[PDB]
Symmetry: D2
Subunit: 447 residues, 4 copies
């Protein structure tokens, strides 16, 4: 036993599973706004010998020796991270160790707040993220709401936009120490400048969680939250198209008196929260960041916007309603109530024809659809019009099964069962797949 044997030879069971998954990805239409397809280059770094180095600490300040190279990698991941977002090193620092997006947010909170200090984020069903704070009537759900004290701010249900006015009123009272600007399911640009005014007034930190939109920001096809925020967090996947990992950016040098984010943020990541860094992820992230500086990436990102517009327009033009009436980014939010349907139903139908989207709250009343993934497969505007055509076939199949049944559980039975419904689906699936398989796919060919 050398540990040099191939996965296909040593673990055929697992290899078959990887191949089934690759085929599923290759044949399907991926419309989850959070997803993307990672470059082969980045995956080669991810599966490298970098997994075998423990490097607790920071470059030049490691617990253990033998880190010359890993130090260079991490410092390079930092530089590339600052370059990708057009940041001055004298004004901004970055931490590249967080294992994912959620860990990065916790590290910020633990670096800057005391337990039980106050935080505000966009309410979850209004399109925020769990990590921004969330509790039901009966219990604390996010760890953020267990260790800290969170109160949500809300959408204006008329405009579908963030009620900035209510935020200011409500934050004058609750007095949060940290306010979070960033979203999971919102189709428009955030008023970073406004949030900053609110934060300046009540003496709070402004954190921007750009996970969804980091690609768009790096490409400069939308305004940057770095003009206005103290701290920025993000995933390295989603629109940045990297491996799964996380980043924390922070202001440094002179504030007025220095900024004091740097030491606290790094200390909270390590030693307070994490163990050994995942150097193979750090390296893949760095590869993804280099890719994001390119003109190619700017084209990709522009195309992301165009394809989301195109998908929006194609849906309007078939009489669907869109929350906020459209989009200024990479996703669209479809209100299936004025079309006599709901996310739960739609999602399950689409799933069965190899189209993957989310139900989303308004049995909830909406659907979220995103462009970044298919765009990465070189989809253009006509291709997305065609996608909508397939979606609409599926909605109309759904609508038909709803008038022919009562409850959600009923609705799902009727689909796997009634042949006239089964065939209409099998036919549609097969067309979707044939259409999808024809487009290219980032990554390795076989796994």
């Amino acid at each position: 036993w050398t540990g040099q044997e191939s996965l296909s030879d040593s673990d055929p069971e697992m290899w078959e599973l990887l191949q089934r998954e690759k085929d599923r990805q290759c044949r399907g239409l991926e419309l989850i706004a959070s997803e993307n397809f990672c470059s082969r280059a980045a995956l080669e770094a991810l599966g490298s010998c970098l997994n075998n180095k423990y490097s607790e600490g920071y470059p030049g300040k490691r617990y253990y020796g033998g880190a010359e190279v890993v130090d260079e990698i991490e410092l390079l991941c930092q530089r590339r991270a600052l370059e990708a977002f057009d940041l001055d090193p004298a004004q901004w620092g970055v931490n590249v160790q967080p294992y994912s997006g959620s860990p990065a947010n916790l590290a910020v909170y633990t670096a800057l707040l005391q337990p039980h200090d106050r935080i505000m984020g966009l309410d979850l069903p209004d399109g925020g993220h769990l990590t921004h704070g969330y509790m039901s009537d009966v219990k604390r759900i996010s760890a953020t709401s267990i260790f800290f004290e969170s109160m949500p701010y809300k959408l204006n249900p008329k405009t579908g936009l963030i009620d900035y006015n209510q935020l200011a009123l409500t934050a004058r009272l609750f007095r949060p120490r940290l306010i979070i600007a960033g979203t999971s399911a919102y189709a428009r640009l955030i008023d970073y400048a406004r949030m900053r005014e609110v934060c300046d007034e009540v003496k709070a930190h402004l954190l921007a969680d750009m996970a969804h939109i980091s690609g768009l920001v790096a490409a400069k096809v939308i305004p940057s939250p770095f003009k206005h925020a103290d701290i920025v967090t993000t995933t390295t996947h989603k629109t940045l198209r990297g491996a799964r990992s996380g980043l924390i950016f922070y202001r440094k040098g002179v504030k007025a008196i220095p900024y004091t984010f740097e030491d606290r943020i790094n200390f909270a990541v390590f030693p307070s929260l994490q163990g050994g860094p995942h150097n193979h992820a750090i390296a893949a992230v760095a590869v993804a960041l280099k890719q994001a500086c390119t003109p190619m990436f700017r084209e990709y990102s522009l195309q992301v916007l165009k394809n989301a517009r195109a998908m929006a327009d194609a849906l309007l033009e078939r009489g669907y309603s869109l929350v906020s009436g459209g989009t200024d980014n990479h996703l669209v939010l479809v209100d299936l109530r004025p079309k006599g349907l709901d996310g739960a139903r739609a999602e399950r139908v689409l799933e069965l024809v190899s189209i993957t989207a989310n139900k989303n709250t308004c049995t909830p009343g909406g659907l979220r659809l995103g462009a970044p993934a298919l765009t990465s497969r070189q989809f253009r505007e006509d291709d997305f019009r065609r996608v909508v055509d397939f979606i609409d076939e599926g909605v109309n199949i759904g609508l038909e099964v709803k008038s022919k049944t009562a409850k959600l559980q009923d609705f799902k039975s009727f689909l796997l069962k009634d042949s006239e419904t089964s065939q209409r689906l099998a036919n549609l699936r097969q067309r979707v797949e044939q259409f999808a398989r024809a487009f290219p796919m980032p990554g390795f060919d076989e796994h």
Copy 2:
């Protein structure tokens, strides 16, 4: 642009860095007890298309669709996890999502305790882990000690063993809700049965953090903490030899009255603490777990023990002292004080001849006091097919380095002086360059798990 281009073509700067690192690993003698070399099979899964699936939730209970296959992978990773540790599914469950070892511990604490509830772990300089709780005189260091209230238990410095007697006395007073049995730098077996008695008495949960020893346990070459613990956490690297990731195991079904670990543990992992699982890691872990069920792995684990013994004996034979006098596991703790040196010096010398070990605090020392010891481990080199004679040879090189360090110390005052002398004094440079080159020539000859080039 397809995103199908190779790393050597698209990012030569990064590719050159990978290659420098691979050459470093190939040419060096890796004695850090936490390290291992991961199989090529596992790394292929890690760098797979599984990176591209969001699967928040659990199998059959996902936020989103399109998870048929990922569900099968995760369930398979679970089964293989239970099988690797010889656990009945009716009695034990497992969560395979934690991103690493440290997150796995936090999830347990948040699942089972209220903020500010009480925890005890082995004091850090006595050989515990940060995640078990740690604060200096002046500040809270571990997030475990910020969100929860931690008090350490200690080694008996006379025996170098864990003072179980003092633990019971001290836990009767402090009244912890969770006691943690597991170590980072301890050369002996833990009395899980005893800890359990203490936990039963004061009404605390017993958590076993087997990160260092999980390989040994899976191979059944040492006793299992699953006989005595309620909850078991571990990394998937170290002696399990997987990709970097984490596991939480927990009792389920009937206690006496049911166990209530399952729902709380899974809930704390997700939705409370984590986002999307890292399915590529989950898959690599599963590959590593399959490998750990094999006879080959049992041979490997036995050999790990024998090589640590052999290294121990070779050090005794040259008049070094070992904390607790030896080892019953994969590591040895070497006391360099009686020999007129310290970990800080030794470590830096060894580093400069491509041997990597840790300085380590010796029992009864207030750290600040520069550490009097060195920790050395067998799992990594054993994975490169080292046998007992190879480790005897490793000790020869170590001893050469110690003796060099000894000479530079007689010619120097302070630690800062000592480090510059190694770079500056040319007679010292050469003696080091000579030794380095012999270490490398010796090391490069042994095989290396992974890919050849990166």
Copy 3:
């Protein structure tokens, strides 16, 4: 040494001080709304041999023996407490041990909430109490805000009333576990029914802190918060006219399923927070409660309302503005801004002519004036008109010193200094005193 010697004989220094204080009270016009003059009967109990008994625990469940009598006293204080507020013993319980008003509130919070649980009270400068929660921009001030998490609700600055609408909006978000209805400086009735609707909606406890108005409630000259609240706290002084002490009332027996307030409330008082009860205070309180059941007390309380009305009207009729335009209770809030003055100035002038009132926030812009004390000295409506006349003389002296100076520190100098100001004051003082000394005074004659 017997310990039977008189205070005048054994401690002349102290006795002189008591006599100076009694003369000050006898000669002055006491307009602080929180104050009253306690009955001689109640003071005799307060200075009794009951100080010499340790009775930790509750009747029949004492740590120590020899408590037959003290048990009877405490049980009697309970019965009289329930009778005074017209409460059914099967529906309400009471705890009579809290050492004062502030301790009673803490005991409720600690009995019913976890540390860091959420509370809302009327903001302090809007006329709430410290114990309801209070923090500045920079620090936690109330212990309530240290051990628990408090967010204030506010007045509508247009109506001078409590913004019930904003409360509901704001409590839907903050999700408090306890909401507190009660005031220190508010001239109107509280919508207990409305607060209850809000509490029912967000699943919170309603606590009513009737400290200011407990006399009025007992007398049934205003609506009772007992119709709507789960828990009621109060001082035993202020309008109840007792010795300094506190009470906690709580619902008991069947809710729908039993109420669980009783055991938690009593346990928090003792053993959790307090030591030995103050049996002499408990006994004085009981004497005061018996007095409050009488027709005499109902007359007194009606007269309190009439005299506050009369004082209001007399102020309107001299062109002062009143927050909320008047009063439905025992106090009035005078806005000295539309009269070109401020509380800080006015208070100090009045003080120097033996009239005691408070500055109150709108250098703040108001003054609070209360009726209960002077009413207890048998003052009637004409007497209060006459009081206002003296007040107005003082305001007009103030106004004159303001146009003749710059800052507050200046203003205070000018008064003790300039003879033409000094004499005008000495003259006024002497008239005030001569007028006041003529009225009777509850208590002992000499101390």
Copy 4:
């Protein structure tokens, strides 16, 4: 209605209750170590017009006007407080507002610690106070243990003294921010100097809660904790013989660098925790403090010690055991186990013959186990002019009661049985009625501080 009418006229029901209580106190033998009988002078201040002034804030810094006189009273109460304990105003400050002893402790903790910070006090059944921290296996009991994190230190059951050695060991681990030296049921002097060494080492505040012994300290018949503590709390009753109220003393001026106790302590009292001060109590306290500076008070305090000795000796002489073998203060702890009885039984018998004492837990016993001991104190009867022979006589009556209890125990099984037999069996009733009547006749003869009638 003037509110000038007498209590006997306006509330005969209440007046009759006061008179029953006064007769009870006059006729009984009060041996509860916490009790005393307050001077008439102090009670006159307590029931004064000072009840009618709101004076939130501090002298010269009041929310409201009209406080010229109350300011003079409070400042005077401060001066007399410092004088009574022989303290330099440049070195010590005092707060005179706390409503009682328990509030004074809470104010100190809230002034100096963060929520969830760590505190150690003498374990409750080892003779500590609730306010020093206390939790059962299953719940937090003291508010001190809810808002803060408390761990007890313990008696050495072999000596009956405080295990200072174990305190140091245990505090090195738990790392408290505040350690509390003071007791409710302890018969000996506390090693303030030792506690201070322990506090200096681990960087904790030393608080002394002298509630039980403040009279003795003021009289200088025992060593002062002010030589060693940073902060001192006390009640104003117990051995100081005042009205029920509380004090907090604190170091001020230069430490080495200034002390920062003053502003925090005063702020926590008000505005953080309390409302309006109880000026009538403040004035009574001041009266009591003046009385405590006198020679008369020193004689009283000396006599307290002698009478406790005398009671101790009289018990030894009749073959009882005393925890720690005797006393150096105002109380004695009697172990009734070797005599074949327990506190629970003894207490109830003594109660029925108008002698009031406490059952009290004996060292090394898990309470639940019905307490094996009795606590007896001298301050109250000494205030009724009892001398040594009078206390010898008290012990005679106690012993008669013990012997009665012994007979009812041989005729009964359980505690519940034992209590009903005392009411029910007529031969037992009479033996008790006889003894009661002799105790009363003996007690009524001694004078009583206070008013005659109420």
